[PDB]
Amino acid sequence: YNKIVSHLLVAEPEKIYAMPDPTVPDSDIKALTTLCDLADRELVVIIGWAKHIPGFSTLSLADQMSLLQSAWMEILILGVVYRSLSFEDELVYADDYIMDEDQSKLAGLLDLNNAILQLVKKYKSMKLEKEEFVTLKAIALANSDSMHIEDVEAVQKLQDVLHEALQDYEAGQHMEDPRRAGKMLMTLPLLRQTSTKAVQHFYNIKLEGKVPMHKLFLEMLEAK
Amino acid sequence: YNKIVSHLLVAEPEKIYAMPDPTVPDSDIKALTTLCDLADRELVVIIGWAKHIPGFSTLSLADQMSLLQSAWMEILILGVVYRSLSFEDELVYADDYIMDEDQSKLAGLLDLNNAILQLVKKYKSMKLEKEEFVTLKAIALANSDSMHIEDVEAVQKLQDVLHEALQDYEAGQHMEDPRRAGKMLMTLPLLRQTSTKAVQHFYNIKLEGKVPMHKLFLEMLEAK
Numbered sequence: 001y002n003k004i005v006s007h008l009l010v011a012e013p014e015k016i017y018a019m020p021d022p023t024v025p026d027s028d029i030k031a032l033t034t035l036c037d038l039a040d041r042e043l044v045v046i047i048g049w050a051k052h053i054p055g056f057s058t059l060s061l062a063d064q065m066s067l068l069q070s071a072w073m074e075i076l077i078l079g080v081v082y083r084s085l086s087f088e089d090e091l092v093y094a095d096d097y098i099m100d101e102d103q104s105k106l107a108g109l110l111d112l113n114n115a116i117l118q119l120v121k122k123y124k125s126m127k128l129e130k131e132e133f134v135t136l137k138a139i140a141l142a143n144s145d146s147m148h149i150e151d152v153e154a155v156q157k158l159q160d161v162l163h164e165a166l167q168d169y170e171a172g173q174h175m176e177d178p179r180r181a182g183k184m185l186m187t188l189p190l191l192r193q194t195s196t197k198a199v200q201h202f203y204n205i206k207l208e209g210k211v212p213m214h215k216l217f218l219e220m221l222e223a224k
Numbered sequence: 225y226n227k228i229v230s231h232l233l234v235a236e237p238e239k240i241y242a243m244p245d246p247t248v249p250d251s252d253i254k255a256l257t258t259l260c261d262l263a264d265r266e267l268v269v270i271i272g273w274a275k276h277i278p279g280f281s282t283l284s285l286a287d288q289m290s291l292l293q294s295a296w297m298e299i300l301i302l303g304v305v306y307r308s309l310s311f312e313d314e315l316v317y318a319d320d321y322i323m324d325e326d327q328s329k330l331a332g333l334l335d336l337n338n339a340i341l342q343l344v345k346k347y348k349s350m351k352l353e354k355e356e357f358v359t360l361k362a363i364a365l366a367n368s369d370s371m372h373i374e375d376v377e378a379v380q381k382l383q384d385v386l387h388e389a390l391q392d393y394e395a396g397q398h399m400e401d402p403r404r405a406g407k408m409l410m411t412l413p414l415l416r417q418t419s420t421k422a423v424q425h426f427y428n429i430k431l432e433g434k435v436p437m438h439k440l441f442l443e444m445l446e447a448k
């Protein structure tokens with residue numbers, strides 16, 4: 001099938017471990033600290049991953065950063081969603097960090113994680129494939145609606161290249177549903193909704209000052 | 225072209241006036257009161273409009289209400305966006321209520337209205353047509369991601385009927401851009417983002433208790 005899809009598949013990063021501190025008592029602070037630490041290390045990996053997206057590294061450094069600062073939470077959430085597809089009512093942040101309903105309540109994350117589980121439920125019904133996941137991550141990056149883009153036409157071209165890849169993949173692989181590409185695009189509003197609420201929630205956690213956060217995570221959070 | 229598109233065009237409601245009270249001194253309270261009053265009357269019109277969407281009135285009353293309670297702000301915002309396309313840096317809430325940057329600041333709405341103006345700017349560049357506007361309003365209703373749907377398959381069918389209408393319209397009217405339907409769908413995340421922030425902002429206004437709000441507006445706000 002589509003070469004851009006095959007290229008994004010081979011550019012997919014390796015799995016990352018959460019490594020919750022086994023000496024620390026379980027608490028809401030421990031869970032939130034573990035999650036923000038894992039997100040910080042995933043952000044490093046996402047920045048390296050984006051350089052494999054056709055045309056991304058030819059953008060100005062400012063435009064690369066603007067796209068990443070607008071899309072980072074959507075990309076992180078799509079990752080947890082994909083890792084969770086073979087599970088029931090659980091979110092697989094990492095192989096060693098899987099959150100059920102009880103742990104979400106203890107962490108103060110029940111409402112947020114239930115929205116993420118709504119995304120999981122929709123993608124399970126659609127039988128989301130890895131090929132479609134990696135293409136949607138790239139589309140979410142290009143379509144992230146930053147207010148600070150210098151070269152709008154170049155960013156629109158990036159959107160178009162990745163949208164064409166999705167369209168071509170679905171036309172060849174899913175002839176039984178001539179509307180599958182559009183159905184995939186119609187899942188992006190819920191992804192944006194859930195990311196918007198997550199950034200809000202964790203900005204409030206940043207303000208309360210009880211959860212330590214690393215430099216890169218704080219930079220992405222303080223942009224938004 | 226497409227019959228569903230032509231049907232939605234003839235079902236389009238007539239324009240509504242804001243009628244700000246000419247005896248009341250200008251203030252943030254007056255602007256917010258005027259806007260919420262206008263929204264309340266537009267909501268009545270939207271409920272009547274939705275009954276013209278193929279299949280909508282065959283849904284259970286609960287599912288009709290769930291879709292409307294999830295989508296109402298997106299539908300209202302898409303309306304102001306469309307009315308504003310021929311203007312520059314102004315939002316046309318009604319023919320008699322056009323807000324520029326200064327009035328947005330006075331009302332406390334600068335950040336929200338700048339996001340709405342980002343939507344306007346994108347649709348201006350795409351040369352959004354009335355045919356595409358009315359179809360996107362219907363898609364936003366069907367795709368609103370309520371957590372309370374009884375008949376999920378029927379709602380998915382409604383999404384599919386309207387998505388097909390958009391696809392067919394673009395295939396016949398815009399052969400120069402075989403990706404225009406998808407580009408239209410890719411504008412829905414920003415619409416969802418802006419609606420999510422608007423509901424937040426006006427819920428806070430509801431809590432402060434200084435702006436009177438009518439029954440239907442309050443019902444929609446208190447659902448969300």
Ligand SMILES: Oc1ccc(C(c2ccc(O)cc2)C(Cl)(Cl)Cl)cc1
Binds near residue numbers: 073077093
């Ligand atoms: O309930 C939630 C917990 C963590 C997250 C995020 C998250 C998302 C994806 C990850 O792979 C890691 C953390 C942040 Cl970035 Cl906010 Cl800590 C989102 C929702």
Ligand SMILES: Oc1ccc(C(c2ccc(O)cc2)C(Cl)(Cl)Cl)cc1
Binds near residue numbers: 304317422426
């Ligand atoms: O800066 C804004 C002001 C009013 C609105 C809304 C609005 C949107 C569309 C309308 O036709 C009327 C009001 C509500 Cl519903 Cl929040 Cl009052 C949205 C953003």
